RNA sequence: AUGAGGAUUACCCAU
RNA sequence: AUGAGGAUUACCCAU
RNA sequence: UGAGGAUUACCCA
RNA sequence: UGAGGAUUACCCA
């Protein structure tokens, strides 16, 4: 097919959407970044390897910029204060069929669906209670 | 009043929906499992920690089982052929606003939306190209 | 530009076609895998290195699986009864021009063309006679 | 019956065709050589052995010469500036039927079909990208 | 859709133009070579690395050959009399905007524009005075 | 001739052009800088030496200021955050004639020509893909 | 703390 | 990391 | 190097 | 066994 295309990472309904696009493919590690300074950009990387005899493993990483009081194109230090890092590791047994995998994706979509426990906690600087 | 509620992890249009419910909160780790035997249950765990002086870290894990019946010693037992493991870590600076966090959530959602690169690859048993 | 795309490995008319898509490309080794269970997938790997000062060397590898189900304890998994392994090494001197290479490729294609000694022998569990 | 006959190794339309004919078949190793100076000839060898109790193993070898004249002391001899060396090993389990073999052969033919990743890379002094 | 495309390295008005094409991307190093034998080809390589926590470094190399024919052992081989090597390293802070980078590109272009000091000296086999 | 004259480094078509001019010649190392504080200036240096028995080598260095959110004449720390550094090394065999050198220059101009892979990647905080 | 480190998975490994 | 360090050129050298 | 083996980018002389 | 080398049915770990 060729899935390495640009896509919408943050959907604000047309107005203010954040689109991320192909920016690197060194070592099979695909990368997408928004149209920003790399210090203030949205970054997404993803790769697959066979972690072991009977397991394959996808490693996905996301970097999201702190936007409140942000200064576009400015030098903001320390970097750790202005960025959030997401690191996902997905282990899938070599026996999983496409169907099995489709389900695994659905579970991930469900986990983060709007209004569910986890996404709500995160969106409110909260934990579970 | 409490965000520790049950939610549908896998949505199949109200029929075959894998719904998960609160099952434990011992040791600051919120757990959720499906209505199966502990050996065949879908499991979701979450925990927040002030990882650093200026950071907070959410640790989330999901277990997707391949339910099966095994004849161990002439007797049938409900078991899992294998399990797929999702493990994600999210680091957020303390300086992040509630709006800054909503941004992070929206991004994770857009990341896994149907048709986009990553979920397409996972469901197809392929890499990004 | 990119030649690390998916292609048809086995041509069975239009339906039954075995297609192999990119999966990984780490450490200078490109890898293609057919869809569905990694356990029953076809695999193809390729790499090129400068073997010596005068020669460049290609190493192609192909795995053909014998799709089968495996029942153990009443638990059935998608597996491969066995696999056929092809491994080839092509050495080409740095003096070879694009024309010399096209010729080398034609030789390989001719060696396997239908009806010729070698593919015929292989296709019939035979040797030469 | 006999498959140890001459065949076209390189197909250049009808004229320019490189044909290789049987030359020797000692010690279980069949050998084909193109006509004229053995020094500038194309060579092809093939053999099959029972590698282990379960597997049979084919070993095919092809040599592509770079025809050139060599003058030394005013004495010119027909030689080969250099040679390109192809060596492949195909392992097939004794459980493979004639159908399984025909499939394995189709995979090899597909791997080298024109326009596919590998033959393209080779034909252009390239690797994968 | 991909910036890894062929391009004309040396422009001689469409006649004698040295055009270079993608040839390899193994190990995160993008390669391009001309349609010659590997021994007489123009070669261009590029790679980006996050050299520091706050920097990114592009490493670019170009090889310009002096094509020639050498009689080694009475036999003629296509070779290079000598090669000229260009090696440039560019360090860009992560804080650089896309506009900040365009500025860098424009500068490098102006640096080598015909008639300016540096290219004038290089083409004249002299220094700056 | 006397090539050590002022020239246009960044060409914005008259309006906003950046002209760099002679500022130092200590030790044969020619320098040009823009009309700015040395902390915010565009700097260009260049020298030639015979690196070895049969090689001459030009060393060219360029410094480009981060302009987005820049404060003219202000004190901006850290320096590494507000500046990009280019370092080119050009090795030319002593056999290269003026013609050979003219070509070497053309290859450099081509490499960085507008719309080509490299300059496009750089201008977009990207790598090759 | 970091790892496109591993897992039988709230554990283990390396720097 | 730095070098107006070297190369047969994705390598090597010094601090 | 190998008409060396394989559990196929691993291991033997 | 080897994305080990070759002067290609040879030789190295």
Curated annotation (Swiss-Prot), chains A, B, C, D, E, F:
One BP annotation, GO: regulation of translation
Effect of residue 76 to A: No effect on the organization of the T=3 capsid, but with a loss of thermal stability. No effect on infectivity
Keyword RNA-binding annotated: yes
Compartments where located: Virion
Outcome following mutation: residue 59 to S: Loss of repression of replicase. 20% loss of binding to the operator RNA in vivo
Covalent S-S links between cysteines: none
Keyword annotations: Capsid protein, RNA-binding, T=3 icosahedral capsid protein, Translation regulation, Virion
Outcome after substituting residue 45 to A: Loss of repression of replicase translation. 80% loss of binding to the operator RNA in vivo
Pfam family, one: Levi_coat
GO cellular component: T=3 icosahedral viral capsid
Residue ranges, annotated region (Viral RNA-binding): 31-104
GO molecular function, one term: identical protein binding
Binding partners and assembly: Homodimer. The capsid proteins form dimers that assemble by group of 5. Twelve such pentamers are linked together with free dimers. The homodimers binds to the viral RNA via an operator hairpin, but also to many other RNA sequences in the viral genome; this interaction probably shifts the virus from the replicative to the assembly phase and ensures specific encapsidation of the viral genome.
Function of the protein: Capsid protein self-assembles to form an icosahedral capsid with a T=3 symmetry, about 26 nm in diameter, and consisting of 89 capsid proteins dimers (178 capsid proteins). Involved in viral genome encapsidation through the interaction between a capsid protein dimer and the multiple packaging signals present in the RNA genome. The capsid also contains 1 copy of the A2 maturation protein.
Family (UniProt): Belongs to the Leviviricetes capsid protein family.
Protein name: Capsid protein
Organism listed in the record: Escherichia phage MS2 (Bacteriophage MS2)
């Amino acid at each position: 097919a060729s899935n390495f295309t640009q896509f919408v990472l943050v959907d604000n309904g047309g107005t203010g959407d954040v689109t991320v696009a192909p920016s690197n493919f060194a070592n099979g590690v695909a990368e997408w970044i928004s149209s920003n300074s790399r210090s203030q950009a949205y970054k997404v990387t993803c790769s697959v390897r066979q972690s072991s005899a009977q397991n394959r493993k996808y490693t996905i990483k996301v970097e999201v910029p702190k936007v409140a009081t942000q200064t576009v194109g400015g030098v903001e230090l320390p970097v750790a204060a202005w960025r959030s890092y997401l690191a996902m590791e997905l282990t899938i047994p070599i026996f999983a069929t496409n169907s099995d995998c489709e389900l695994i994706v659905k579970a991930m979509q469900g986990l983060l669906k709007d209004g569910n426990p986890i996404p709500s906690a995160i969106a409110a600087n909260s934990g579970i209670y």
